[PDB]
Amino acid sequence: MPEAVVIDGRAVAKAIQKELTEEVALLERRYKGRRPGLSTIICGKRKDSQTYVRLKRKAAAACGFRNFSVELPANVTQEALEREVIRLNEEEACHSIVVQLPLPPHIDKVAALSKIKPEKDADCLLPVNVGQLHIRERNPAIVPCTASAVMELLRCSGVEICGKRVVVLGRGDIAGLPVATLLANEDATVTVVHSATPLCDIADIVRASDIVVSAAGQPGLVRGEWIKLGAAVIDVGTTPVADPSKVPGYRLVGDVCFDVARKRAAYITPVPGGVGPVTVSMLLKNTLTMFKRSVRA
Amino acid sequence: MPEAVVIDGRAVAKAIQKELTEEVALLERRYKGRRPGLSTIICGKRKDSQTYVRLKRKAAAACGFRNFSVELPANVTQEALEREVIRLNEEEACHSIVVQLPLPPHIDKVAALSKIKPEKDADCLLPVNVGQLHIRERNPAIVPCTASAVMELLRCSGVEICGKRVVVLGRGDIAGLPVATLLANEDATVTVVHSATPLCDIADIVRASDIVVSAAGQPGLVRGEWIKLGAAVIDVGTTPVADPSKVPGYRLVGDVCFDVARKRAAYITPVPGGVGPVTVSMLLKNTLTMFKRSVRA
Ligand SMILES: NC(=O)c1ccc[n+]([C@@H]2O[C@H](COP(=O)([O-])OP(=O)(O)OC[C@H]3O[C@@H](n4cnc5c(N)ncnc54)[C@H](OP(=O)(O)O)[C@@H]3O)[C@@H](O)[C@H]2O)c1
Ligand SMILES: Nc1nc(N)c(NC(=O)Nc2ccc(C(=O)N[C@@H](CCC(=O)O)C(=O)O)cc2)c(=O)[nH]1
Numbered sequence: 001m002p003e004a005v006v007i008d009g010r011a012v013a014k015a016i017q018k019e020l021t022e023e024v025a026l027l028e029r030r031y032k033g034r035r036p037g038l039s040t041i042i043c044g045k046r047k048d049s050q051t052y053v054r055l056k057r058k059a060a061a062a063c064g065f066r067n068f069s070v071e072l073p074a075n076v077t078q079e080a081l082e083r084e085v086i087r088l089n090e091e092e093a094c095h096s097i098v099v100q101l102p103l104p105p106h107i108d109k110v111a112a113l114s115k116i117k118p119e120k121d122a123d124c125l126l127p128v129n130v131g132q133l134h135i136r137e138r139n140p141a142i143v144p145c146t147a148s149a150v151m152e153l154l155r156c157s158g159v160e161i162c163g164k165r166v167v168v169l170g171r172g173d174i175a176g177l178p179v180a181t182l183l184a185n186e187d188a189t190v191t192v193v194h195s196a197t198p199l200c201d202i203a204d205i206v207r208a209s210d211i212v213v214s215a216a217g218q219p220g221l222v223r224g225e226w227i228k229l230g231a232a233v234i235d236v237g238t239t240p241v242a243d244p245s246k247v248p249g250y251r252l253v254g255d256v257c258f259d260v261a262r263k264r265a266a267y268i269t270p271v272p273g274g275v276g277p278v279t280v281s282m283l284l285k286n287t288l289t290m291f292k293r294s295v296r297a
Numbered sequence: 298m299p300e301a302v303v304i305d306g307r308a309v310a311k312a313i314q315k316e317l318t319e320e321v322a323l324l325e326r327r328y329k330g331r332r333p334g335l336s337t338i339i340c341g342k343r344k345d346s347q348t349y350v351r352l353k354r355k356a357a358a359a360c361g362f363r364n365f366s367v368e369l370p371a372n373v374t375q376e377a378l379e380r381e382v383i384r385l386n387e388e389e390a391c392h393s394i395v396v397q398l399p400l401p402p403h404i405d406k407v408a409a410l411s412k413i414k415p416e417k418d419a420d421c422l423l424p425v426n427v428g429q430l431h432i433r434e435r436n437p438a439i440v441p442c443t444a445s446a447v448m449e450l451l452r453c454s455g456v457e458i459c460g461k462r463v464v465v466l467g468r469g470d471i472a473g474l475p476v477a478t479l480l481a482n483e484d485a486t487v488t489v490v491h492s493a494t495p496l497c498d499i500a501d502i503v504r505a506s507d508i509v510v511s512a513a514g515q516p517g518l519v520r521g522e523w524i525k526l527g528a529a530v531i532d533v534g535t536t537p538v539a540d541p542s543k544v545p546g547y548r549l550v551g552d553v554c555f556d557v558a559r560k561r562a563a564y565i566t567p568v569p570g571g572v573g574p575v576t577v578s579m580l581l582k583n584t585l586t587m588f589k590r591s592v593r594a
């Protein structure tokens with residue numbers, strides 16, 4: 001029987017990173033010695049955050065980037081965190097700064113993020129940068145990495161977006177929020193819903209949607225039987241779920257009931273191995289774009 | 298024979314303005330003469346635009362503000378427009394700048410608005426200020442005027458928003474776009490319809506909606522029959538429709554088929570007399586907030 005095409009995010013990331021690597025080796029030869037510099041700051045020891053930072057550094061290193069890795073304690077003072085951001089602002093060879101979220105509760109997140117120099121805001125977390133996405137008459141320099149990865153996976157699918165009904169579940173600053181904007185810019189009719197939105201409404205909305213982007217962080221939220229036949233389903237959820245057989249005691253589970261959804265969708269992405277690897281690749285893309293902009297002098 | 302409550306925008310707007318007037322009076326004593334300065338720039342002679350700026354200036358004067366009224370010709374060049382904006386950026390006595398839309402078609406709207414100094418952006422049109430709107434944990438200073446007026450009227454009516462089904466028709470930068478953002482921050486289920494949405498889908502979406510906010514500028518777009526029994530209906534449409542009995546040769550007509558919708562809805566706004574007057578009030582509120590920020594220096 002027909003079933004959804006499972007889009008392989010690892011292969012998509014691989015191809016992107018192959019092209020980035022060759023681009024860097026060319027640029028270095030053109031700009032005697034220069035190369036993109038990525039900074040990642042992690043506070044505390046959440047195992048999932050540790051994993052994602054390690055993967056970013058590893059990818060960056062593989063593509064010929066330089067890494068500026070910072071690790072701070074759960075304890076970190078507002079001042080110590082901001083001083084570290086500022087240090088990276090003045091480092092010429094650092095073109096991107098990533099502050100891995102979530103931050104510890106006691107930190108003022110907005111304050112701290114606001115210290116990042118706009119030209120180095122690789123996550124597109126700053127108002128001056130996120131406030132650009134809605135301008136369709138201009139193409140924005142930076143787009144948040146997760147949102148960007150979703151759009152890249154839709155591009156890979158090749159599904160039409162204009163005139164289509166889209167549901168985005170969740171409204172996270174680097175995922176749900178920016179992606180709804182980017183989908184509407186492509187002339188989709190976008191509905192936004194939340195994990196705790198009444199289920200009867202979510203079901204009704206998903207049933208009518210040509211494209212599903214789930215970024216609510218709630219495993220099994222999107223029932224397979226709600227999926228409209230031939231829909232494209234992009235699963236951004238990456239929620240830790242207890243599994244004593246795995247290295248950190250949990251597995252990552254997506255928002256979508258994939259086993260049922262794959263029988264109805266035209267396209268679907270798996271978790272792990274879908275949006276996540278491409279999210280890392282988009283950070284490297286933003287960073288190379290920022291590198292090139294700064295080198296135009 | 299039972300019917301919607303018709304929300305009285307003029308009365309809301311007057312309540313807000315009596316508050317602003319007191320506030321200005323005390324600040325003028327505190328800061329020995331200083332007062333909020335509002336500049337309104339109009340290009341050309343659209344009768345509706347002329348009316349709206351005249352109402353803004355009149356309300357500003359009544360609340361004790363200083364007006365910087367600028368009139369430019371319909372054939373104003375991009376440079377002369379931007380030069381005027383720049384002049385107002387450098388004027389210490391000016392705290393808010395409004396560039397009345399729509400601009401003449403030869404004018405690049407985005408480039409022109411981009412010259413406004415961020416702290417004087419009265420309409421909250423610039424990326425740095427659009428970019429703060431989602432930040433709930435802070436209370437931003439500047440709020441888009443039409444959008445905040447819509448929220449104000451909903452609040453006045455006691456209407457629930459969190460978890461309700463909301464449809465916004467239109468996505469223009471003055472009305473549709475920010476309205477949708479503000480309603481989404483309330484964790485409403487928000488669908489945005491626009492010109493690429495097929496009409497049949499519009500009808501279905503409106504029928505399922507607890508709150509309808511129409512900012513398309515198309516008279517008669519929202520059929521009364523589509524309105525869910527008990528819904529709240531906010532008409533942001535203000536289209537000039539020919540009527541030679543009226544002073545400018547036109548009357549203002551809303552997006553909503555009001556006479557039919559009034560029999561089904563629980564709350565509705567009239568056009569005129571609804572969102573319009575409150576939009577003006579919210580401009581003055583912004584302007585007073587921007588003044589207060591400015592004089593902390
Ligand atoms: N001109 C004035 O003096 C003035 C000033 C303020 C407010 N208003 C009123 O408030 C409204 C706000 O609009 P705006 O000034 O922010 O910009 P605008 O360009 O008038 O916005 C119109 C929006 O409605 C959409 N739309 C238009 N016709 C439609 C239809 N038949 N079906 C579905 N969607 C439709 C457009 O879609 P696309 O994005 O696909 O084009 C656009 O997003 C105006 O339409 C007007 O009635 C008027
Ligand atoms: N500042 C900032 N904070 C954030 N929290 C994010 N999210 C942010 O990095 N997410 C993310 C999610 C998944 C993966 C990933 O590659 N996951 C692998 C598997 C992970 C694993 O091995 O457990 C996969 O899904 O295939 C990488 C990054 C971000 O992009 N920027």
Ligand SMILES: Nc1nc(N)c(NC(=O)Nc2ccc(C(=O)N[C@@H](CCC(=O)O)C(=O)O)cc2)c(=O)[nH]1
Nearest residue numbers: 349352396397398399420442569570571573574576
């Ligand atoms: N930059 C910019 N451009 C814009 N086009 C707007 N909109 C922008 O001023 N709208 C507006 C709409 C209605 C009224 C208003 O008071 N209308 C009266 C009718 C007045 C009359 O026609 O006599 C009413 O609805 O009751 C005032 C302002 C704006 O806020 N900023």
